[PDB]
Amino acid sequence: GSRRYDSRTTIFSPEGRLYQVEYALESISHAGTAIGIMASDGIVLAAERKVTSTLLEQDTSTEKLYKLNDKIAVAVAGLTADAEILINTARIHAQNYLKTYNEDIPVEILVRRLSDIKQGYTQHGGLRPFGVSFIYAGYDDRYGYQLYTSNPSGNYTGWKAISVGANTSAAQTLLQMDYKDDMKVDDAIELALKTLSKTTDSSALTYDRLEFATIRKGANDGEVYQKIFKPQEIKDILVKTGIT
Amino acid sequence: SDPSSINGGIVVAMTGKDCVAIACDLRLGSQSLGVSNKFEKIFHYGHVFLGITGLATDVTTLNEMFRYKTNLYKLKEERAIEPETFTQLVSSSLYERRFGPYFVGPVVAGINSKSGKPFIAGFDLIGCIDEAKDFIVSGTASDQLFGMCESLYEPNLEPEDLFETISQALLNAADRDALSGWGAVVYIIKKDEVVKRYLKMRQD
Amino acid sequence: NNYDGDTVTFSPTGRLFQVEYALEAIKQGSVTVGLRSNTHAVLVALKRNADELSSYQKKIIKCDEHMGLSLAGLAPDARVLSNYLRQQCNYSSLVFNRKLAVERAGHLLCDKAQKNTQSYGGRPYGVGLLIIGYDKSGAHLLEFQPSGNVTELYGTAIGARSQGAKTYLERTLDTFIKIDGNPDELIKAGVEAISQSLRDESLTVDNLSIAIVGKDTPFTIYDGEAVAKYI
Amino acid sequence: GYDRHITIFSPEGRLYQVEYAFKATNQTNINSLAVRGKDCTVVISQKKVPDKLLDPTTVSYIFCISRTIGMVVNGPIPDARNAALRAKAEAAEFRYKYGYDMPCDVLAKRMANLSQIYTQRAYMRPLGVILTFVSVDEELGPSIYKTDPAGYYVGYKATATGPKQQEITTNLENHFKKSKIDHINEESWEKVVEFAITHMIDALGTEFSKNDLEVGVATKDKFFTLSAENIEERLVAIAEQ
Amino acid sequence: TGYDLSNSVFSPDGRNFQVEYAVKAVENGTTSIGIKCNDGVVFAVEKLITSKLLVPQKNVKIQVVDRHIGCVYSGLIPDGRHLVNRGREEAASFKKLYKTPIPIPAFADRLGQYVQAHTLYNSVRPFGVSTIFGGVDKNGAHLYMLEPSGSYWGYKGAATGKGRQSAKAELEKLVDHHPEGLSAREAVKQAAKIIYLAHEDNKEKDFELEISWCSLSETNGLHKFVKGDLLQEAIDFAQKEIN
Amino acid sequence: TTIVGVKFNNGVVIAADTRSTQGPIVADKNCAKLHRISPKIWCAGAGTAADTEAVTQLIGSNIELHSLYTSREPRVVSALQMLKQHLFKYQGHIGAYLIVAGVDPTGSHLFSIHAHGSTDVGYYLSLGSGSLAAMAVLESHWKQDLTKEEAIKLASDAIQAGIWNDLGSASNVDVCVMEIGKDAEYLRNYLTPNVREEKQKSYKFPRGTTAVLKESIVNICD
Amino acid sequence: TSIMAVTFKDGVILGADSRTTTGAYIANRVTDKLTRVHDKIWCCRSGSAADTQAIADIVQYHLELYTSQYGTPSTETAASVFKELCYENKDNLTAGIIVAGYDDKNKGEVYTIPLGGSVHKLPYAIAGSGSTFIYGYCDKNFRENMSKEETVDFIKHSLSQAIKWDGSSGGVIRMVVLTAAGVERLIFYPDEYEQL
Amino acid sequence: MTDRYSFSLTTFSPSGKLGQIDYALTAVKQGVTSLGIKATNGVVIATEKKSSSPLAMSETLSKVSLLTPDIGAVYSGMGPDYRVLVDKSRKVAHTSYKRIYGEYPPTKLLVSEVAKIMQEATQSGGVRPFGVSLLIAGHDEFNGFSLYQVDPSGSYFPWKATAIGKGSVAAKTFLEKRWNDELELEDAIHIALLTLKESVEGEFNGDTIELAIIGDENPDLLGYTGIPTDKGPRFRKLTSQEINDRLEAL
Ligand SMILES: *[B]([O])([O])[C]([C][C]([C])[C])[N]C(=O)[C]([C]C1=[C][C]=[C][C]=[C]1)[N]C(=O)C1=[C]N=[C][C]=N1
Ligand SMILES: *[B]([O])([O])[C]([C][C]([C])[C])[N]C(=O)[C]([C]C1=[C][C]=[C][C]=[C]1)[N]C(=O)C1=[C]N=[C][C]=N1
Ligand SMILES: [Cl-]
Ligand SMILES: [Cl-]
Ligand SMILES: [Mg+2]
Ligand SMILES: [Mg+2]
Ligand SMILES: [Mg+2]
Ligand SMILES: [Mg+2]
C-alpha cells in the first residue's frame, strides 16, 4: 500500500534527534542572516536579502521582516512561503486574543502559540516541518521590550541579542563581544549593521541587500511605534554608521 | 421581547460640504429601567466611523468583530480601509448570519481619503445597504429622526452649521422616545480633523 | 518472498502468501474432526494444554440451538467469527422467525473472511472452522478456511496430523453416513477417526471435547467426565 | 527509485508514470482519425476483431457521450469506459446545472482537469487513454478536442491517434497545405467520411472492408455511429472513382 | 524493477503486472464456459472432486443475479462471490429506480467498472477471477466474459480456467458449423461435452458437472439450474462423445 | 415595488421604480432595483431587498467564473437555472422575486422567478406591490413587434401606473435596454419628477443654538 | 389546473389549460404545463409550480443520463423516476403529475401520480382542481382506440368544461400529440372552445 | 480506496534541500520562455505559442490568461498545472475577496492567495508541487501597476522586469540593459518583442507569439454603459494583427 512511500517525518534517530528538524535547521543555515538586538529604549531588527538582482523591485518587496500587529514584528530565516503561512496564523491569534480580552496580546503568548504549532508538525500528522526560524521583536506593558527566537522544533528562547540563518556562529560571537546592557537603540542599530557587514558572504553590504526595522518608544509619549525602513532610509543609516 | 427595542437608542448621520457628521444617544436600558448613560454607540476604525443601534450585546460584539477584521485588512493591504469598502464588509458580514441575524441597525460614516468625497450608509439587520446622499437614521426613534432630518436638513452645510442641524435632529427625536436620550454625542468629521462633542440634554 | 509483506499483493505465480501463512497457522493448531449422518452431526476436538498446571484450551463454540463449530488455529479469531455467526443466526430468528440455514451460514463466513484478503491494512483470519448444524434440510457439516473457501462435506478434519483422520473417514464414508438415530455410535466413529491423528499422547478425560446436534438434539458440548464414556 | 512508481518529480523534472500511461495508449494497436467538414465532424477508427468467438457488434472504442458529443478512445477498453462513463455523467450534470448542452471543448477541458489531478495526486493513477471529443458546437461549429494522460488538451483542424499517428498526421498536414483551409470543403457528411477513409487508406497503405472500420459522425444537434452497411456504401463509392 | 510489487503502477511497458499476476490465479482455476444459443444462454463449470467426502450437488458454483442473469467464474472463488454480491446490489438499485430488470449490457458495465476500480489504487488487490455471465433481456440473449483488468466483451462462446484452450477450440467449431444458430437444448448438450473435453487438463482428479441456462422458450427468460433428467441426458451425451 | 420586463423585436427592456419601505415608512427614495448579473444580463428585483442583492451577486459571481471557464458569453438560461435552484433550495425563505432579462448568442430572453423557485416565460411581465397597476397597462397597450422606442415607453408607462396607484411604489424610473449586437444601456433615473417644491422656510440654525458640555479632538491618525 | 392525458389508436395526447394563480390573481395566463422529460415522454403538471418544475428538471436529467448509458427509456421507467421523487419526498412536495409517452413496442401509455406518490397506469387520466367537474363527462365519453381527431375533440370538450367551472383553470388549451410520426403541438383559444 | 497518502511527498534531505521543489524548478527551466516588463503607465507579459502540431489550432490554447479585469497571468513549465492554477486563482479572487469587499483584489493579495495554494502543494499530504513558475501582472487603485513572479515553493517576488523558463538567464541580462524607470507601455512592448525574439527558433509573428498588457481602462470592452465609476478592464490581450504591426517597427 501507501506505507512504502512514507518518509516518516516525525521519528527519532537512534541518538534521540528529530531527523526532519535537524535537516530543516540545515536548510535555514543557508538562509540570509537576520539579527535582533534589544536595547533599553527599543529593539532593532536587521536582515540580509539573499543574492538579489538589479531588476528586483525592492520598495514593494518583503522577504525578511513582517508585521504581526502594531506592537510585534518578526524577522524570517528559511522558506518564505512557509513563513507566510505561520505569519497569517499568528496575525489571527493576536486578533482573537484582542477580541476576547480587549487587550493587545502579550509577546510571549503569541510566540508560544506559533512555537506550539511548529511542535505539532514534529510529533504528529506525518507532514514535513516548517523550514523557518523566527526572531520575534515586540513590546507589552508587562515585560517591556522582548526578543525571542523559534525554530522548526517548536523550541523558543528569549534574548538580549540574537542571530538566525547563515553564519550565526560568527555573528553571535561578534554580538557577544560588543553588546552591553545599558546600550541604546542608535548604538544597537550600529552593532546590527556592523555584524552583518562582517558575517556577510557578499563582497559588500549595500542598501538593496538589506531589510531593516525598529520598535521604539520613540513614539510621542507612552506608546510604541514600529518602523519598517524604506530603501532610501536604509541607505541613509548605512552612510550614518559609516559602512558605505 | 422585540430584541431591537430592549436596550433602546438611536444613531443619525448626515453629509455636509466636505464633511460628514454622525451622532448617537448614550442610553442603555432594560426596557423601562435606565441602566447606563455612558453607552456610546459610535466607533471608528481608522478614519471610518460606525454607529450601531439595536441589541447592545450585538452592538458590542460587532464592534469587536469589525475591529478584528479592519486590523487584519490593514496588515495585509498596508493601508486603512475606506468607507465604501467597509460598507461592503459590513453587508457581507451581516448577511452571512441571514437566518440567525445580529439585531442591529448599523450606520457607516466617513470621508474617502483619496477622493475626499463624503460618504454615509445605513443597513438593516441582515445587510441591505441604504446609501443615501442626504442622511441616514437608525434606532427606536427612527420615525422621529426621519421627520426631523427630512424637515431640518439641507445640502452642502458647513461643518459648524451641520453640527447644529444634526444635534437638533437627534435631541428632539430622542425627547419623543422613551428609550432614547440620557445624553448624546456628535462627531464632526473632516478629511484630516475630527471633533467630538457631548450634548447637554434632559435626563428623563 | 518479496510478495508476502501484505495481503493486497499477488505473487508472480498468482499466489497470496499472507493467506497461505494464515493457512499455516491452522496446520500448527490441534486436531479436530467433523462428521455427520442423516440424523445427527458430530464434532470431536483434541484440546491442547500449555503444561500440566494449565487447563486445556476449549475448541468448540455454540452459535445457536441448532448450530455450532470447532476451531483450529488462532482462538481469538474463532471468537470473532463465532460471534459473527451468533449475530447472523440471531438476526435470522428475530427478523424472519427463521433458523439460519447451515449453507447460508457458510456463505456469510466466506464473504466475511474474503474482505480481509483483498484490503490493505487488515490481515486474513488465522483460524480454520468446522461448522455442524441441523436445519430444514437435515444434518450438515462445513469446513471453513480463512482464504474464504467454505466446503460442505460428509466428514473431515483440520489441524496438525489431520490427514490420518481424513483418510479414515474417506474409508468409513459408507458406514458412518448410515448411522441414523444413534448418537453414541456416530460419536464413536468420530472418536475413532480423531484417534488416527494421535501420536505419543492419547485421549484422556480433560483432553477430549465432543459436540453433537441432530433431529431432536440441541447443539450441546460434552467435556470432562461426560466424555469418559467414549474414552 | 520510487519516483518512477508514483506521480512525483524525477530529478529531470519528469513524471514517469504519465510517460508510461502514454505508452499504454498504443496497447490496442488501433489508429483513429478525425476531420471536420462544413456542417459536420467525422471520426474514423480501425476495428479489429481478432477472435471469432467475439460478438463484433460489442467491440467498439467510439462512444456517444451526449446527443451532440461523440468520443473515440485510444487505449485499453477498461480505462476507455471509465472515461466514457464519467464524461457522460459530467455532460448530463452540466445540462442540469447550467441549462444548456455541454460544449465539446468544455467537456474536454473538464476531463483534462480530472487527468491533471491524477498527475498531481499520488493515490490516483493516470488513465492510459487519449480521448478525442467531436461535435458540431452551436457556437464554434465543427469541433475536435483531444485529451491525454498528462492533462493536456487542445482544439484541432484534424487529428490522428495511434501507433501510426505520424504517417496519418503528415498525410493530413500535406492535404491542408494544398487546400489552405481549416476543414474539408464538402456539403454532405457522407463525402467527408469518404475523405477520412480514403486518406487513412493512403497513409497506412492498407485496404479496408466494412468490418475493418468504425465510423462516428457529428452533425448539428446529434452525433451518431455508422453501421457496417452504411460503411459498405461508403467503401463502394470510394472504389467507383 | 519493483513495478510489479504494487497495484495500479505502470511498468515501463505500460503494463499493470499485478493485474497480469491475477490472471495467473484465474488460469490456475477450474474450467468454466458459456454458450450463447438462439433465444438464450447456457453456463457450465468443472467442479473438481478433491475427495469422496464432498457432498454431491451441494457446493454450487454458478450464481444467479436478479432472476434473469447467470454468473460463473474461474479462479479465486471468494473473489467471484464478492463480485456477484456487488452485481446483486447493482441490479437491485437499477430495478429500484428504473422498474425494469437490469439489461445484460448495462449489468456487464456495472461489473466492469467495479473490477476496473480495483486496478486504480495500491490499497486494493485486483480480482482473481474471470467471470462468464449473461442472460435474456428485452433485446434478447447476451453472453459476456469479464477479466481481472475490467476488460469485457460480448461473446458467441466463452471459456476460462485451466482448460480454456481446449474449450475455445471446441466453441470455435460450433460457431463455424452453426451459423444459423444453436438451440437451448442443443447448447446444454454441447456445454456438457466441452467441459468433459476440457477436463483432460485436470485429468488427475475426477469432477462433477454443473450446468445452468436462461432461455426465452425453455425457461421464460429466467435463470434456472439444469437438474435431474435433463442433466443426466447431457452427461450421457458428453460421455458418449469422449468415447 | 413595481418592476417590469418587455421584449421587443431585437432585444429586451427592463424597468423598475426606486422606493424602499419599512412598513409605511420610506427608507430610501432612490433605491437601485436593477442589477447586473453579467454585462448583457440584468435582473430587476422585488421582495426582501437584502435577498435580491445577495442572490443576484452570488449568481453573478458564479456566472463570471463560468464564463471564464468556458471561454463563452454567459446565457440567460444559465442565470435562470442557477437562480431558481438556489431559491428552491431555501423553500421561499430567501424573499427574492425577480425579472431576469438579457441577450446572449442564442438571442434575447425574458423570464421571471418567484421566491419558491418557479420560473415563467413571456413577452411582458411584472412583479411587486405595483405589479397589478403595471400589468393592467401592459395588458391594455402591449402588441407584438414593438420597436425599441415603443417598448421603453410601454415599460416606463407600466412603472408609472405603479408609482401613482401603488403606495409601495414611488419616485423615479430606472431602465436598462439589452439589444442584440449592442452594448446594454443602463438608464439610471430615466425619469424623475421635474422641478419639485422648495420648502417655504430654511431651518438653518443660529450658531450656538445647541448647548454643549464637552469638546475634544479625535485621534484618527496612527 | 385542468390537465389530462389520453391514449388512442396511434399513440397518446396530453392536454392542459394555461392558468397559474396566486389566490384569485392570475399570475400567468399563458403557462405551459405540458413539459418534456424526453423526446417522446412528456408530463402534465398540477399543484406547486416550483415543486413540479424542480421534479421535472431532475427527471429530465435522470433520463438524459439513462439514455447516454442504456438507450431510450420506456414510459414506465420515466413514471418510476417521477414516483421515486414524489414518494420519498411526499412530506415536502405538493405535486400531481401525469406521465405520458410513446414507444414503438408499447405504443401510447399513461401513468398518473397523485399527491401520495402512488402510480396508476390508465387508458386516460385527468387531474388538477378542474378535473373534479369532468369525471362524469370523461367517464361517459371516453372510448378506447379513438382516432387522433376524436381524441383531440374529447380533450378539447373535456377541458372546456373544466375551465368553465373551475376558477383555477383557464386561458388557452394546450395539447401535445405523441405518435410514431413525431411530436405535434396544438393550441386552442377561448373563442374556439367556449362556444362548444 | 480513500486517499491513503496523508503524508508529505516533499521532504528535507540531509543537505537541507527540498527535492521536489528543486525538481519542479528544473521542469520550469525546460519550459518555454515567458517574460514580463513593467512600464510607468502599464505592464506587459509575453510568451511564445509553442504549437505541438501544425494541425493544432494554437488560438484555442491560451498561455496568457485573464484572472481579474485588471490582472493577467503567464507561465513557464507544465501547461496543465498552469491551467488548473488559473481556475483556482480566478475562483479565490471571488470567494476570498470580491464576495466580501465587493471589489476585485489588489495584485499583491491575489498573488498571495495563488502563492498559498502552491505552498500547500509543497507541504500537504499525497501531492507533488506545481511544476510552473507564474508571472502575474496587474493594476489596482492604491498600489498602481505591479509585476510578480511566483515559484513552485510558493515564494513570490515583485519585479520591474524579468523572464522565466528556457532562455531566462540570457533574457534577464537583455532586460537589465534596456530597462529604466521612464519607460512608456509601447516602449516596454517593443523591448518585450526584442527580448522574446532571442529565445525563439522558428516563426516569429502574431500567430506564434502571445502578448497581453495591463494598461488603460477599456470602456469599449466593458459590455455596458450607464455607470460612470465602471470604466472597463485594464487587462487586454493583443491581437495577431496588433503584434505584427509592431514587428514592422522592430
Ligand atoms: B419592493 O417593495 O418589492 C421592495 C424591493 C426592493 C427594495 C428590494 N422591497 C422593499 O422595499 C422591502 C419591503 C420589505 C419590508 C419588510 C420586510 C421585507 C420587505 N424593504 C426592505 O427589504 C428593506 C429595505 N431597507 C431596509 C429595510 N428593509
Ligand atoms: B394548477 O392550478 O394546479 C397550477 C399548476 C402549476 C403547474 C402552474 N398550480 C398553480 O397555479 C399554483 C397554485 C395552485 C392552484 C390550485 C391548486 C394547487 C396549486 N400556483 C403556484 O404554484 C404559483 C403561483 N404563483 C406564483 C408561483 N407559483
Ligand atoms: Cl474542473
Ligand atoms: Cl409552470
Ligand atoms: Mg426620552
Ligand atoms: Mg425617564
Ligand atoms: Mg498518481
Ligand atoms: Mg375559468
Side-chain angles (χ1 to χ4, degrees), chain A residues 30-43:
Chain A
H30 302 294
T33 311
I35 290 171
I37 301 173
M38 189 261 288
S40 56
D41 62 321
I43 303 168

Side-chain angles (χ1 to χ4, degrees), chain D residues 37-135:
Chain D
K38 291 171 67 69
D39 294 343
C40 64
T41 311
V42 171
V43 58
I44 65 163
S45 178
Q46 283 180 303
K47 182 171 177 170
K48 290 178 185 176
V49 190
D51 196 347
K52 293 196 288 175
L53 297 179
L54 284 164
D55 184 357
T57 55
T58 68
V59 180
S60 178
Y61 290 85
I62 296 182
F63 299 86
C64 300
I65 302 303
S66 67
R67 254 160 272 162
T68 57
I69 301 174
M71 184 192 71
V72 68
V73 186
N74 257 95
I77 195 69
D79 286 9
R81 284 162 178 164
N82 183 104
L85 178 65
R86 186 55 178 274
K88 288 172 185 188
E90 293 288 347
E93 193 192 50
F94 187 96
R95 173 58 185 77
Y96 174 73
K97 288 188 177 180
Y98 308 111
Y100 74 98
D101 294 337
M102 195 174 201
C104 177
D105 57 298
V106 177
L107 175 60
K109 186 192 175 177
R110 173 55 180 165
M111 297 302 293
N113 286 147
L114 262 24
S115 288
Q116 187 286 143
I117 290 165
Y118 315 141
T119 70
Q120 187 154 209
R121 229 101 92 189
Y123 87 107
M124 289 257 46
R125 74 163 170 86
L127 299 172
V129 290
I130 288 176
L131 312 172
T132 312
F133 296 92
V134 291
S135 82

